[PDB]
Amino acid sequence: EGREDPQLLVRVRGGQLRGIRLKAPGGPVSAFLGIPFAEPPVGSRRFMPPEPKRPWSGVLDATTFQNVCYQYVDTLYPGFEGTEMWNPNRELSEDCLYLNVWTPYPRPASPTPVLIWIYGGGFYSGAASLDVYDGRFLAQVEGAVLVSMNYRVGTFGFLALPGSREAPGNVGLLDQRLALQWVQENIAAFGGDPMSVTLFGESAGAASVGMHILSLPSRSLFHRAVLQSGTPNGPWATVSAGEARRRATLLARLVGCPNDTELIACLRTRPAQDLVDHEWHVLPQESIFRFSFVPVVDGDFLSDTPEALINTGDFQDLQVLVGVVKDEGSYFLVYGVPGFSKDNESLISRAQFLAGVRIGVPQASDLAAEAVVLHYTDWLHPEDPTHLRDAMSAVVGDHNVVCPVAQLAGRLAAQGARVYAYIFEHRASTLTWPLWMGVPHGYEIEFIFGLPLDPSLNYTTEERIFAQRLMKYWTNFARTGDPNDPRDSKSPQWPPYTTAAQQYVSLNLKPLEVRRGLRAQTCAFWNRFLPKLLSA
Amino acid sequence: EDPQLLVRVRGGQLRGIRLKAPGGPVSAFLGIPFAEPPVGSRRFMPPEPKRPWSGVLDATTFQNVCYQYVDTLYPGFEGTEMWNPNRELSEDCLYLNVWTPYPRPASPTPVLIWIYGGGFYSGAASLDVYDGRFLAQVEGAVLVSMNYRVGTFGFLALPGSREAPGNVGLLDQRLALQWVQENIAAFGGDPMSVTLFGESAGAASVGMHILSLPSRSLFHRAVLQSGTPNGPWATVSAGEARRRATLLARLVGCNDTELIACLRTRPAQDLVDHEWHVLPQESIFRFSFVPVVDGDFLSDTPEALINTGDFQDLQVLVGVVKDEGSYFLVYGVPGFSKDNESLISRAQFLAGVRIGVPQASDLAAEAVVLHYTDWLHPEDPTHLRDAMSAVVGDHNVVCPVAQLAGRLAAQGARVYAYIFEHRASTLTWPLWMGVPHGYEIEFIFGLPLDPSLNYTTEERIFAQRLMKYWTNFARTGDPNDPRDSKSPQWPPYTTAAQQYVSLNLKPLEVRRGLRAQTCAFWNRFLPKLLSAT
Ligand SMILES: CCN(CC)CCNS(=O)(=O)c1ccc(Cl)cc1
Ligand SMILES: CCN(CC)CCNS(=O)(=O)c1ccc(Cl)cc1
Ligand SMILES: *[C@@H]1O[C@H](CO)[C@@H](O)[C@H](O)[C@H]1NC(C)=O
Ligand SMILES: *[C@H]1O[C@H](CO)[C@@H](O)[C@H](O)[C@H]1NC(C)=O
């Protein structure tokens, strides 16, 4: 060194790093991208827990994003921004255990609250390097220290032969945990406060945040949590040990690998792409919103099912922010369900609805499916194709996201937690998906991260103000455990969610509005009745 | 000797009585025998036609009420006593009543035939609320009402036997209908225009005449108020009927013939004493002796018959009151009383549901609980109270009615549907009960026209509106005024639009869907759940 920006040279436990000075609309920020936090989980390390990165020599260049974890790439609508924004934007590799840090420039002298993003993508996809997860705006505008990590997905992260030494399960969650431990030890070098760490994530990332809440070894690694449109409880976020074993062994057969030791050793000789090419062939039924390789109830990371853990747990020390978007189900109707497409109005017949219900609730008996159909049908217009399309969307959204979120919010509050809840109702002026899909799963994210502040992105002026409001809620929550700004106590307050009043707020261009009951009637069906009907 | 009050029917001469209605005189012929007294060896047997009589038969007074259980609930309270027998109890009770304008109509007049309700265990055509003088005077109607046997005397059945074949109370009604066909012209009635109307079990009876072929030549249109032949209480299987009669005979100390011969030796009150001890579960809105699916009067279950019937030339008017279930909570559900606001707890609600839906499995009962709970306010006592009432009213009345209306319309019938929403200013029951089962009746019969009863002037106008709908329906099969214009018209109920009207102090308002979501639960889902549980 000698002639470089002195603000971009930082030492961490593993060695020296050189970051990059980035431009945000309001000024510069420091970014340290592609910092290794584990040994590359390759070869004999495939399917194994991550090992901490061994120290390196010299100055590691941390100026670009590292590889994306090897993963299936969505083929729906090539070239279309609505899908492409979620696709990997760096080389796919099994050597992908790297994290990213954004801080103000120059770095703060007083220790700053840290936000850690965990991406979603159904546990089969995602990357910390996507444009929508760009930490520069939260760092510049709110002065946050923002961290995001890559973690293994698909078979590489979640293929499990439970009980085995060579594929114990949940290693993608152990990748996340290792990154949290890296933050505890190192974030002070960047001006971050390791004693104020807030996790946030969306969809499977939210499910992940939920796992860390429920897993004792993660508890010392963060202080507050935000779960956006996802939960550890619910029908897709976990599988039993038996089901994980069945899926792993079928996958092994499909790629020519028919003792766990021998099976796993044969799996390790397979090219990454071979595993990806068969990953979707192991689901027990035709389905949507079901993913082959997800966290497993192993009796270790998860000592019991998340449902059980949230029923009995003491959550007195927990402050949590949770919520959903207006149209959780709509995105998913195109991927499976005859009659749907982003390219037509997707009006469907009653026949397509009945068939869609079997696909959207693949675990349902005939009787359970009838109950669903009966509840969601408009008996004044039982064959109206607009209503049926919207009802199909509501079925998928409620079953997979809204009611699991309502259930989580309810259990946490009853057991000590401080809970704030929201519904996100603003549809981006820039959205490329058709109007009937409303505010789909994932489309609050660009607002939380403050992308509308980028003038080149063509958001309206009101959307910029809106984005700034949300960034304030999120960072207020991270700082204090309360999304409300003191010294603004005239602005409408966001009351905590309680079992008694069930209050949540609407997030849109208008001032906060308080509502009561998170789909209360309908969620009673999914959360109280349906389990009893399935058990008969 | 007023010659307006002297009539010859097939059995002989009758002398009626000139009555006063608020707007002029009416002729009444009360206590006309239509059958041989069903006593002694005729107990439990089909009715036989009345033998002819000599001289002039005195028809100036109401005859005996059919022998029946009398309600003990709130002694001396008008809300209950208005339904109790107002003449002496007797097994000798097969008499009918006729009201006509005075003087006798010069042209043949549409006939309305009233069939009282009372759970098939009680009721009488002599009750004040069934007074036909107002309809006769104001609308010029010829109004007929009959007594029919109730309880064991009307419905005890050993299906297959000769001596207790079942449904004889329905056969009493049918014999009275036959009597109308044969004799009503002598009063100025038109036997080619006969409209049955009835409430609760009376409405269920009307529905059974619709479903029974020999009845179909005896009337032309029907009104069903708050009751239906389909549904959970109005019929029993032959096996359950046989079980109940066999149990009753055991309880009083008694081969079909020998069993029935012994029952016939028992004084009437001994049968009544054990009438309520034969129900299979603790329950409400369930009655021991009701019409039986015999393969005779009823060729199959009402549900099967309304599903497959051809109802092309049928016109029907059907409806419900706003609070069908509220009356019944006092009768079995712990926590309910006319004397306090009956705010109940959640546990009382869960227990209430097992009583109100006695055939429900644990899982079915939980479905009901979870459907009717307001999950925004799950423990709120006033909601739980109102939910309890809705459960009982929807299960026993509202949803069976929606089902019947839908089936009849889909299979060719002309159907008109209503919800009756006006609470009488004079109502003696507490406010929380709203507009209870049975409280549209006094309005249809025109009681507010009686100044000594202190109804408001609005209620008097409302009453006249309803008498018009009912009599227009009787005359034409359509309750709308034939020439008195003005939107809003009352549109036919159809499966597509599902339109019905609200009957209250305001002008007709058209609504769509009779509790559609909730009735889909009762009518489509619950049967599936019960079958597989
Ligand atoms: C996390 C960002 N996502 C939200 C838009 C993009 C798509 N991934 S997903 O997990 O929602 C998903 C969607 C459809 C199917 Cl079929 C499977 C998974
Ligand atoms: C005739 C209209 N009724 C006015 C409500 C009179 C009361 N008898 S009942 O059939 O309604 C009845 C009473 C109690 C129970 Cl439990 C069931 C039915
Ligand atoms: C209403 O009245 C009855 C007794 O008359 C009682 O059982 C019920 O609990 C009362 N409601 C109150 C005061 O809780
Ligand atoms: C919006 O900005 C201009 C139109 O003024 C257009 O050329 C550009 O492509 C748009 N940007 C995006 C990212 O949509």
Swiss-Prot record, chain B:
It comes from the Eukaryota. It is a peripheral membrane protein. It is found in: Synapse; Secreted; Cell membrane. Its EC number is 3.1.1.7. Gene3D superfamilies: alpha/beta hydrolase. The active site is at S200 (acyl-ester intermediate), E324 (charge relay system), H437 (charge relay system). CDD domains: Esterase_lipase. GO terms for biological process: acetylcholine catabolic process; acetylcholine receptor signaling pathway; cell adhesion; osteoblast development; positive regulation of cold-induced thermogenesis; receptor internalization; regulation of receptor recycling; retina development in camera-type eye. Pfam families: AChE_tetra (PF08674), COesterase (PF00135). Predominates in most expressing tissues except erythrocytes where a glycophospholipid-attached form of ACHE predominates. Keywords: Cell membrane, Disulfide bond, Glycoprotein, GPI-anchor, Hydrolase, Lipoprotein, Membrane, Neurotransmitter degradation, Secreted, Serine esterase, Signal, Synapse. Disulfide bonds join C66-C93, C254-C262, C399-C519. InterPro entries: AB_hydrolase_fold, AChE-related_enzymes, AChE_tetra, CarbesteraseB, Carboxylesterase_B_AS, Carboxylesterase_B_CS, Cholinesterase. It catalyses: acetylcholine + H2O = choline + acetate + H(+). Glycans are attached at N255, N340, N454. One of its GO terms (molecular function) is acetylcholinesterase activity. The keyword Metal-binding does not apply. GO terms for cellular component: basement membrane; cell surface; extracellular space; Golgi apparatus; neuromuscular junction; perinuclear region of cytoplasm; plasma membrane; side of membrane. Terminates signal transduction at the neuromuscular junction by rapid hydrolysis of the acetylcholine released into the synaptic cleft. This is Acetylcholinesterase. It comes from Mus musculus.
